[PDB]
Amino acid sequence: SLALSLTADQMVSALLDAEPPILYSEYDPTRPFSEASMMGLLTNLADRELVHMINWAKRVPGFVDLTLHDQVHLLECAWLEILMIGLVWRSMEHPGKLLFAPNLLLDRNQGKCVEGMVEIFDMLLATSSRFRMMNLQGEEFVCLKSIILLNSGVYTFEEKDHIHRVLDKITDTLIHLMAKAGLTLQQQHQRLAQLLLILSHIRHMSNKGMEHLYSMKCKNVVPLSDLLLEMLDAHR
Amino acid sequence: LALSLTADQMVSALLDAEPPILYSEYDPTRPFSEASMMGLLTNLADRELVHMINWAKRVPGFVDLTLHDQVHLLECAWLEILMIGLVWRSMEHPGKLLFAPNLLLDRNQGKCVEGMVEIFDMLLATSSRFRMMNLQGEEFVCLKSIILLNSGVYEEKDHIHRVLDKITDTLIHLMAKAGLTLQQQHQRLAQLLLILSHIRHMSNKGMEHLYSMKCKNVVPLSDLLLEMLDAHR
Amino acid sequence: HKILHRLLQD
Amino acid sequence: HKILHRLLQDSS
Ligand SMILES: CC(=C(c1ccc(O)cc1)c1ccc(O)cc1)c1cccc(Nc2ccc(F)cc2)c1
Ligand SMILES: CC(=C(c1ccc(O)cc1)c1ccc(O)cc1)c1cccc(Nc2ccc(F)cc2)c1
C-alpha cells in the first residue's frame, strides 16, 4: 500500500484534498417545519452527502487497498458517525447551532419539530462546542474523520493488520500536527487522547440516531432512499 | 488532591481499588434455557454493580464530583465497565467469555439466547484484540477509569478533564517504562482509546436488547439494573 | 431516592 | 446486490 510511504505532510494534503463538498438543503423559507418536512430535509441532505462520502472514502489513503467487501463493511458501520463529525465540524463557528447546510441552520429549538430529536441535537451541540473550546483545526478534523472510517468497523471483521497500520500512520500525522503547532510532548498526547475520547461519544450519538431512524422506518412515513435503507439494515 | 498523584501512585491506587472476580450461581446440572442464562448473566451483573459502585468511589477524582454527577457517570458507563471487565478476564480464554470462573462461555452457547450471538462476537473480538496488543493490567485499570469519567461527560467541569489528562499521563508513563519509543507510545495510546469506541458500541447494542427483554418476556431484572436501564431510556 | 444514589452515600 | 457496491466501484 502506498499509504504507509506517505509523510505527515503528504498524509495531510491528501486528506484536505479528499474533503467532500458542502451541500445545500432544499431551499424553502416556509417556516416553521413540521415533522415530515424536517425529517425530509435531513434525509435528503444525508442521502446526497453519502454519494460524496464514498468518493471521499476511496481517496482516504489505504481505503482503496481494501477488498470491496471490507470497504462496504466499514462504510456501513460508520456512515452516520462520519456525517455527524462533519455536521459537528461545520457547526463549530455557530455556537448553539447545527449547520446542516449553509442554508439550513437549526438552533436548539426546532429540534422539537421532531419527537426525540432534541436529545440528539444537544449531544451534537455539546460535541460541536467541545470541538470549539479545544480549537479543533481542519487538519485535525480530517484526521479524526478518516480514523472513524477505518476504526469503527475494524473489530467486526492481514487486512485488519493493514488497517491498524494505516490508523497508526494517521496517529503519527496527528501528533505531527500538534508538534508543528508548538505543543509540548505532554500536551500532544493529552490532546490526542482528548480528541479520540470524543470519537467514543460520536459513536454514541450514532447508535442513538440509528435506532430512531428505525422506528421512523418501521413506523413508515418520512420516505427514506433505498441507499439509506441499505445502510440502515446493516445495523439491524 | 487527585491532581497531585504521581503516575506510579495512580497505578497503585487504581490497582488497589480493583473489585473481586465474583462467581456465577451457575448450576452445571441444570439444563440451559433462555430464561436461565439471562438470569445467570443478570444476577452476576447485579452483584458486580455493587462492587463497581464502591470501586468508583476509589477512582481518583470521582469523589470530588457532586453526588448528582457521580450518579450520571455510572448510569452512563455501567455496562461499558462491566463489558471491558468481562473482556479483560476472558483475555487468555480465546473463543471463550469468562463471565465468571465457573461460567466460561463460547460463541455457540450464546445462540441459546436470540440476538446474543452478535454481542458475544464483538466481545470476543475485543478480548482477542486485547490479546494481540498484550494489554497490561496497569493499562486496563486506566482504560476502565477513563470509561467511567468520559462516557457521561458530554457548569464548567474541567476537573473531570483534569483527571482524564492525568490518566493519559499515567498511560504514557506506563509505556515509557515498557521501553517503547515516543512514536510507539502515541500509537499504542491511540490504539487503546479507539477500542473504547467499540466498547461504547457494544454497550449501546447491549442496552438495546435489555430494553426489549424488560417489556417483553420478563427475564426479571434486579431493581438496581432496572434503574440503571431506564437511565438510557 | 434512587438506589445508585443511596449506595453512593454509605 | 447493493447500491453501495455501485458507488464504490464507480467512485470518482
Ligand atoms: C442529525 C442526523 C442526520 C444527519 C447528520 C448529519 C448530516 O450532515 C445530515 C443529516 C440524519 C437525519 C436523517 C437521516 O435519514 C439521516 C441522517 C440524525 C440521524 C439519525 C437520527 C436523528 N434524529 C432523529 C431521527 C428520527 C427520529 F424519529 C427522532 C430523532 C438525526
Ligand atoms: C454481556 C452482558 C452482560 C454482562 C456483561 C459483563 C459482565 O461481567 C456480566 C454480564 C449482562 C447481561 C445481562 C444483564 O442484565 C446485564 C449485563 C450483556 C449485556 C447486554 C446485552 C447482552 N446480550 C443480550 C441481552 C438480551 C437479549 F435479549 C439479547 C442479547 C449481554
Residue numbers in the entry:
A (entry chain A): 305 to 461, 470 to 548
B (entry chain B): 306 to 459, 470 to 548
C (entry chain D): 687 to 696
D (entry chain C): 687 to 698
Give the exact sentences the study uses for this entry.
ERα contains structurally conserved globular domains of the nuclear receptor superfamily, including a DNA‐binding domain (DBD) that is connected by a flexible hinge region to the ligand‐binding domain (LBD), as well as unstructured AB and F domains at its amino and carboxyl termini, respectively. The LBD contains a ligand‐dependent coactivator‐binding site called activation function‐2 (AF‐2). AF‐2 binds the signature LxxLL motif peptides of coactivators such as NCOA1/2/3 (also known as SRC‐1/2/3). In the canonical model of the ERα signaling pathway, E2‐bound ERα forms a homodimer that binds DNA at estrogen‐response elements (EREs), recruits NCOA1/2/3 (Metivier et al, 2003; Johnson & O'Malley, 2012), and activates the GREB1 gene, which is required for proliferation of ERα‐positive breast cancer cells (Ghosh et al, 2000; Rae et al, 2005; Deschenes et al, 2007; Liu et al, 2012; Srinivasan et al, 2013).
